[PDB]
Amino acid sequence: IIIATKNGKVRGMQLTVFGGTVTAFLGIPYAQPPLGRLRFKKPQSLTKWSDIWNATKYANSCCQNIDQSFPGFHGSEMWNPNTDLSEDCLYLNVWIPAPKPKNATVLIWIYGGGFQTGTSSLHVYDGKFLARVERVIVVSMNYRVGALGFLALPGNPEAPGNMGLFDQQLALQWVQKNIAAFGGNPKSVTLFGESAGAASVSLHLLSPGSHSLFTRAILQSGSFNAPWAVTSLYEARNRTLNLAKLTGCSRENETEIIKCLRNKDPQEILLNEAFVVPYGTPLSVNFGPTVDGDFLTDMPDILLELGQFKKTQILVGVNKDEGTAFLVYGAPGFSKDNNSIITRKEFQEGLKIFFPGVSEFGKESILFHYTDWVDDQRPENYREALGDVVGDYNFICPALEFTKKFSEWGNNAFFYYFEHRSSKLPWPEWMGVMHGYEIEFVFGLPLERRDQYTKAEEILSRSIVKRWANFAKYGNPQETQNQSTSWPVFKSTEQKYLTLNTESTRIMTKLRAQQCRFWTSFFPKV
Ligand SMILES: *[C@@H]1O[C@H](CO[C@@H]2O[C@@H](C)[C@@H](O)[C@@H](O)[C@@H]2O)[C@@H](O[C@@H]2O[C@H](CO)[C@@H](O)[C@H](O)[C@H]2NC(C)=O)[C@H](O)[C@H]1NC(C)=O
Ligand SMILES: *[C@@H]1O[C@H](CO[C@@H]2O[C@@H](C)[C@@H](O)[C@@H](O)[C@@H]2O)[C@@H](O[C@@H]2O[C@H](CO)[C@@H](O)[C@H](O)[C@H]2NC(C)=O)[C@H](O)[C@H]1NC(C)=O
Ligand SMILES: *[C@@H]1O[C@H](CO[C@@H]2O[C@@H](C)[C@@H](O)[C@@H](O)[C@@H]2O)[C@@H](O)[C@H](O)[C@H]1NC(C)=O
Ligand SMILES: *[C@@H]1O[C@H](CO)[C@@H](O)[C@H](O)[C@H]1NC(C)=O
Ligand SMILES: *[C@@H]1O[C@H](CO)[C@@H](O)[C@H](O)[C@H]1NC(C)=O
Ligand SMILES: *[C@@H]1O[C@H](CO)[C@@H](O)[C@H](O)[C@H]1NC(C)=O
């Protein structure tokens, strides 16, 4: 219950899970607190300690604006930090099965949230069920989000960009140096993540500094080639300057700007992040990954296109209704509290909200491609169309394109389409299988017969958990014991994918083929 790590001993705590025991180490530091002269810098190496570090509580979450759009509503508030905000947030968590394993595969979770929010302490990222049920080790880290994590003056070590990515990288390396002491196999490390975390995972596939830090990869609802995932070096600079002016820190010595931004206080930086883009959307990523020339040596689309990435197996997937969650955060006529039937002209107005800098002709080409109703009468037609637009453009099509390009270089890839709507889903039914609501199934929360999930959800979560684990341990996401549908590899020819739900597990082909041809080939031209 005490473990010696390369920088000191840490005390853990024991959890009882399903008539058994998991050992939890919550809040292990892994970097020097990035405070004072360290803010905006790459994380620094943690200096040794002689005590027992008490790893018994989740540590501070990184500073972030929180979602206040639905005060008191669990659908939104379940994603807000459940631990004090602080700049002193570079901690990680380890769940180890009991008894202590001897060469366990390690699952490293990277949370998502548009690169501006999120924290490893969330209830639906609790790693104890995976450790209990499949006897893997689960690791998760906090990493700096927003401008504190991704503010970029490229080339300038005072604000080089991609600090949050380097936080993640530092944690991956902590797993390399220390997880063997916990009973884990550092040669069997699977990164998994969702949304911006999935996109983070995919950039770890392109980053040479990360190639030796993990074995395999799982990408849930995200990848770097998503339109939100990489800030241009153009946007990045115009955005730090806009931050600087809104903080009265505009100097000409760009390091003087950073030193000036360093003595502003977190909430003053946080309050101004929102306005560095002239027009934002519910998908805005004001401060995200950039081609820093360090973590990321070239535009990632080129590296993807030209085969420059770690060669290994990947597991990629998306949910049936990725886009709906964003509609009630700005789109006219939408509300979580009715069925949000919108008209044609509301739909068009919605496009102007989601595609502000897109020409009139671009916005018409979207309307044209999505408004060809099989049934002209359905009053939901435009409501569903807008969600499909938002989901295909932002998630499903970039994910498919990522998997095609990655598998063309010879590696086994598996693709899933999650289409089960949680029976506990607090959001209205019309929003469907929403962005982020497969995470609870992946982490095995429906395995706890106490918390209001159906039988069928237990069965499906149990199968997903087995498949994620077999992918991590063995590179192959099969459930071999219970006469399950075999999960085929995804090849750029047949493009077979696996659907996940309670009813039927079907092999299908060429997900959203007609919609993605518009987004991936035509639309980038406009
Ligand atoms: C590049 O920077 C300028 C400055 O942004 C403005 O000031 C910031 C501090 C912030 O408050 C933003 O909301 C502002 O927009 C941007 O130029 C402005 O453009 C918008 C309309 O596009 C408008 O507010 C003003 O006409 C412009 N202001 C100035 C001083 O020129 C510009 O949009 C930024 N981005 C790009 C891609 O050019
Ligand atoms: C669904 O609800 C939306 C959201 O607006 C409502 O306004 C509050 C007063 C309350 O009634 C809540 O349920 C919502 O927050 C409706 O959009 C509104 O529509 C009316 C009439 O068109 C208009 O006055 C408002 O500007 C709209 N608000 C917006 C666009 O934010 C919508 O009409 C409702 N749809 C259905 C089918 O009931
Ligand atoms: C670290 O914790 C030591 C023992 O704490 C034990 O665990 C917690 C959960 C409580 O149940 C406590 O009563 C247990 O004994 C302390 O003795 C020690 O002082 C702590 N160290 C620091 C630096 O806080
Ligand atoms: C763990 O497995 C690796 C190969 O994945 C092996 O080289 C190593 O010796 C093993 N360590 C143990 C069993 O302690
Ligand atoms: C001002 O900028 C120069 C480079 O133009 C840099 O060398 C110097 O360190 C900056 N001033 C301070 C006080 O850092
Ligand atoms: C396989 O089926 C058994 C019932 O025979 C069930 O208890 C078990 O949880 C299932 N395992 C998986 C991985 O689905």
Numbering used by the authors: 4 to 529
Quoted from the paper:
The active site features a choline-binding pocket (main contributor, Trp82) and an acyl binding pocket (main contributors, Trp231, Leu286, Phe329, Phe398), which accommodate the choline and butyrate moieties, respectively, of the substrate butyrylcholine (or its analogue, butyryl thiocholine). The catalytic activity features residues Ser198, His438, and Glu325.
For the design of probe 2C, a more conventional approach was therefore adopted, based on the crystal structure of inhibitor 2 in complex with huBChE. As the naphthalene and 2-(dimethylamino)ethyl moieties form crucial interactions with the active site, the indene group was replaced by a 7-(diethylamino)-3-(thiazol-2-yl)-coumarin moiety. Indeed, the indene only has non-specific interacts with the protein scaffold, and it is furthermore oriented out of the aromatic gorge, towards the bulk, which suggests more permissivity in terms of fluorescent group substitutions. Unsurprisingly, compound 2C showed lower huBChE potency when compared to parent inhibitor 2, which is known to be one of the best reversible inhibitors of huBChE. However, compound 2C maintained good affinity, with an IC50 of 88 nM. While the thiazole ring is positioned close to the parental indene moiety, no clear electron density is seen for the fluorescent coumarin-derivative moiety, which indicates that it does not interact with the protein scaffold and is likely to be free to adopt a variety of conformations, all of which will be characterised by the coumarin exposed to the bulk. Probe 2C showed relatively strong emission in the buffer, and the addition of huBChE induced an approximately two-fold enhancement of its fluorescence intensity. Improvements to the ratio of the fluorescence intensities between the bound and unbound probe might be obtained by the introduction of a more environment-sensitive fluorophore that can interact with the protein scaffold, in place of the 7-(diethylamino)-3-(thiazol-2-yl)-coumarin here, which does not. Most notably, the emission of probe 2C is significantly enhanced upon binding to the active site, and thus can be used as a tool to study the activity of BChE.
